[PDB]
């Protein structure tokens, strides 16, 4: 939609109230680790076959190294993004922290299961004769992780408790201990809006935050199309190996796709320009698969140090990086636990309702001109105030926030004003 | 890895423990001769334009028979199957086609060929499965009886017959009375005189055309049954299917005559075994995944096991016991203290710890492994539970 | 010609979805908004300012005091203008400054080519032309010429899309740099160096 | 064809490939270029 506004040279427009907002982001850490027995899935249970690939050299030895690195990658990818700590931290049974309420994100001792409750509704909105019996009975076989759901939800505890009790300084050295309504002012502080705001409206600034969380768990649960980033990456998976197990039923060329028959029918002058075209196809299948994993292992790994990155940079600390760590200006982050990824909530800050004043950039007195040190000059009809930017929060003019350089000659829009 | 020293960690190995030792050789029970007579030795051939079809159904054929007594055999030539593995099949169909030709014409019964015997007279499809006999027979064939057509204005089709006897026009069609310059009659009898070169002497042709399909078999060859040989590793031959697996009892359905069954990826897992009818299951002889942990040949000699997917109570059923050398009963079924169980599998040839530590070689689910003594003074392999801080 | 060869073969190129025109809107929006607003509409609702305001609070940004911008908005405004005016007769002289882009249509092109190239080679059998071996041969040995000219087409198939998925990685590795610098540099400012 | 259509799915696999890399292109120029919901109007004035 168009907005059209042309200019305004004498006009400052100033927000006058802002909002909490949560916001998630989605990213994908590793994926499943698979390991391919070549003779199995090459030859079956035929010894010719086996003697006939004994002389293409050393391809299965290549290809088992690829897929190995691969799955070694995996668990390394995990245990650089979640393990960011080397202590774990007791999460605190009182979950209420001068009214914000992480009732949400840190596990519930009643309930057995040990995770968050959203940390649960997420794990259940991912959802993956017989398909797994056709895959092992041809060498094809997947690997657990060595980190288990247990471990990944202590490390995500622990991080939330941390930067609960003792905000963002246990990434640098050990954790000193502040309330969290101090933090939540230092973190004020650090986007330029003085930490005043925080304590003269904490109690609304507390409710807008529960109420964002809970719209975010209610959002999570309507929308079913939020995580499918993650849901991809199994299903890219998953198709690929079927894919695989259907290549067994074709041919190349030769008489027929079951070495038995060939190797029951056909002496040894055609039975080898048989069996050629049907080793050659399944190396070539095999290939393809072992590149496309390499690549689409690339694209994860790029996407792991990201993660690393945002958590690294938004869970230990604030940043000032334009949309970055959330739409808006960023007061903090928490990381969840998903199968395969993390799930970040941002919680940043948004302006709005805001009103529109007359301005001037300097203030005459004496012949000198004074400047603005932090602020920004209006006028709200009567009176000249100095105000911040991000906020309507005006001052008295005072010596102590303007500084004067040089003389009002040159000086372009300066208008005439006592202290 | 192709290699005598090897460092220390966990390594994916092939089977190279487990071989076949028995054979089971099941076939159907049939004792009826195939009527090799009234074919080969038959007293009466007809011509190369009318030739005849015969089908030959529940008879068992061995072909050692046609080496007593019978005459030997210019031309033997397969295409489809090879001559050395006709005693070990079984085939669905059989057709046999008999026609008797002069010998220079001998070499146009084949795929891809022209001339008068291959496109006016007896065409065969290319993709040709089957045997093709010859052999001469001027002792016995004689006289001016024996027709093939000369003049067609199309060529035949592959299995076709053209009996019309019909006047032939040279430019176009119809010719009734005949006597005109342009009316030609349409056969030509080959003339089998006594003393005539060699090359334009009789010969007779039989075409054995085969069909192996998904179907009841009736025309199998000699082999004896072995009886079935359950829960281990074998070698079967049930009919014409050849592979290697372990049997098992099973209950699942067949669409009345059917012979096995495949999955997507055409893995037979399922033969109907006759003279019992009951429908068996195949497995392969090993699959899964084993694994060995080791500390390093330059520090210790001692390895640990573990099997992936399996629970500490059919591991004597996983791995054959039974078919294993002595070095290996150690590990699988007995227990000094070494079966262990976790998430990730069975664990063979290590003890475990409760203290937790770091991770030296990593199991899974949580579970590392590392080399160290005990309390009585013995280097053994010691598996834990990772710890996180 | 060169084209009527590619789409006589069935290698087709389809147009983007975005025209030119819709990315001209985009780009003048992007200016008009930080022409008249500032970086405000990249955190929020677009709040309105006078551009040497805006310039100002960019002095800010950098430890120097917006009264150098007050003692010299003539000089400053005319060294931006030259500098425009100097870019354009750099950009009209040197003619390899866009030979980045510039790769990236040739080297695209080439490829195509390339394919089309590969059809006139035979991978050992008799000829490159499919109706050549079927209307001189049997099918016995007829399969036996098919096969190597299938499945050499069958790999150069192959290798182009290879190429291309690990070209389409690289240039995805610099479209998300793209993006990350057009919200950092162009809707705020950025304290990296370099 | 007849005798192609016995090599499996490869086609199908390119194909795949190729329209996945033609809708990340999309992707791409929407990600660096469509960033704002909001069309201001040029001003008539060009010098401020
Ligand atoms: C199955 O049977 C049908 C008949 O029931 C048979 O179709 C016949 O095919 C032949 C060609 O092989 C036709 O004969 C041609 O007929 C046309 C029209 O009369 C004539 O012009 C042709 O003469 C020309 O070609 C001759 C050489 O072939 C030359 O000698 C002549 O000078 C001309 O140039 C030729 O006579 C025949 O007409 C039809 N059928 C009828 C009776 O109409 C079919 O081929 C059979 N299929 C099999 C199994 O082969
Ligand atoms: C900014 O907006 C919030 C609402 O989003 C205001 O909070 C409300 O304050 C009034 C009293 O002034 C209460 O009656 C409402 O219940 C509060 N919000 C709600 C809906 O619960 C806040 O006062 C506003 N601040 C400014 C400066 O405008
Ligand atoms: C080998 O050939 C000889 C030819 O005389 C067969 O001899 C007779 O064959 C008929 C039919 O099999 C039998 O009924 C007679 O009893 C046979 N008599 C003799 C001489 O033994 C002989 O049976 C053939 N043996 C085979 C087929 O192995
Ligand atoms: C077929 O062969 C004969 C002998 O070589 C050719 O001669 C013909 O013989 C027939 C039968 O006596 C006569 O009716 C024809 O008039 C003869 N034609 C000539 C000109 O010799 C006959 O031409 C051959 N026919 C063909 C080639 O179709
Ligand atoms: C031939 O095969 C048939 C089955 O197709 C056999 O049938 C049964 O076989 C069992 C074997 O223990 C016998 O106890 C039954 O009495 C048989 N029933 C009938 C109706 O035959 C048959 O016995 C087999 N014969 C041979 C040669 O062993
Ligand atoms: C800077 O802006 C001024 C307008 O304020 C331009 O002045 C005229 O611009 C037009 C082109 O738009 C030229 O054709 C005229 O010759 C310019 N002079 C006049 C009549 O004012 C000026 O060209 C602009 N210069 C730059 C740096 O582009
Ligand atoms: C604002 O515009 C008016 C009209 O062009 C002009 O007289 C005045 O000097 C301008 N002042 C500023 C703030 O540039
Ligand atoms: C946190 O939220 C839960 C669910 O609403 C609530 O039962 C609990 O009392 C809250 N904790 C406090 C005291 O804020
Ligand atoms: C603010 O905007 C309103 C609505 O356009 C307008 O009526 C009012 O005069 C404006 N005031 C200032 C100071 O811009
Ligand atoms: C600012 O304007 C308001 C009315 O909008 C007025 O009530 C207030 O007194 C003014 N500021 C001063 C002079 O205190
Ligand atoms: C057919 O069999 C009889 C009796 O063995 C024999 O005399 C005759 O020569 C045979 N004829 C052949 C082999 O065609
Ligand atoms: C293996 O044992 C575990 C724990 O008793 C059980 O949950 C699982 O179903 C068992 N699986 C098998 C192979 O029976």
Known sequence: ??????????????????????????????????????????????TECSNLLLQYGSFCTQLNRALSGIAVEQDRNTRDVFAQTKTIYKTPNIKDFG????????????????????????????????????????????LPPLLTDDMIAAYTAALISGTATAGYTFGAGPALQIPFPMQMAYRFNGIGVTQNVLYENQKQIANQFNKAISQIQDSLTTTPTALGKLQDVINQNAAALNTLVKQLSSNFGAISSVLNDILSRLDPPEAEVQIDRLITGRLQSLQTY????????????????????????????????????????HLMSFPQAAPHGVVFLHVTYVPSEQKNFTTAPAICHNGKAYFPKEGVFVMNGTHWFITQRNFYSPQVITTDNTFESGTCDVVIGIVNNTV | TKSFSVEKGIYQTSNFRVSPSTEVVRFPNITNLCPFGQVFNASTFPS??????????????????????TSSFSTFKCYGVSPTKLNDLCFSSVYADYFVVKGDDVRQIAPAQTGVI?????????????????????????GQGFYYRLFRHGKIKPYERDTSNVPYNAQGGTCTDTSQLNC?????????????????????????????????????????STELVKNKCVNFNFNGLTGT???????????????????????????????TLEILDISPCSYGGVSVITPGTNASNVVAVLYQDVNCTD????????????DWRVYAVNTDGNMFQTQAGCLVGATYENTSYECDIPIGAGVCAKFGSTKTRQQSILAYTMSIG
């Open chain 1, 1 to 46: 939609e168009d907005q059209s506004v042309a200019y305004s040279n004498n006009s400052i427009a100033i927000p006058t109230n802002f909002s909490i907002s949560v916001t998630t982001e989605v990213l994908p850490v590793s994926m499943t680790k698979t390991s391919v027995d070549c003779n199995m899935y090459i030859c079956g249970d035929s």
């Open chain 1, 99 to 142: 009214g914000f309420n992480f009732s949400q994100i840190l596990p519930d001792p009643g309930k057995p299961s040990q995770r968050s409750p959203i940390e649960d509704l997420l794990y259940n909105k991912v959802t993956l004769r017989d398909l797994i019996c056709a895959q092992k009975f041809n060498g094809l076989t997947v």
């Open chain 1, 290 to 329: 072992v590149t496309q994993q390499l690549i689409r292992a690339a694209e994860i790994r790029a996407s792991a140090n990201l993660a690393a990155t945002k958590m690294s940079e938004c869970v230990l600390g604030q940043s000032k990086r334009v949309d970055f760590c959330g739409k808006g200006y």
């Open chain 2, 48 to 69: 190369v334009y009318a030739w005849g079809r015969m089908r030959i159904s529940d008879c068992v054929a061995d072909y050692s028979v046609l080496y007593n007594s």
């Open chain 2, 118 to 142: 291959a496109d006016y007279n007896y065409k065969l499809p290319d993709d040709f499965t089957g045997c093709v006999l010859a052999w001469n027979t001027k002792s016995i064939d004689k």
């Open chain 2, 184 to 224: 030609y009659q349409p056969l030509k009898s080959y003339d089998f005189t006594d003393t005539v070169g060699v090359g334009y002497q009789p010969y007779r042709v039989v075409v054995l055309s085969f069909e192996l399909l998904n179907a009841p078999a009736t025309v199998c060859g000699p082999k004896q």
């Open chain 2, 245 to 275: 697996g372990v049997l098992t009892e099973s209950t699942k359905r067949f669409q009345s005559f059917q012979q096995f069954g495949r999955d997507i990826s055409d893995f037979t897992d399922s033969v109907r075994d006759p003279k």
């Open chain 2, 315 to 326: 591991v004597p059923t996983m791995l054959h016991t039974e078919q294993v050398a002595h």
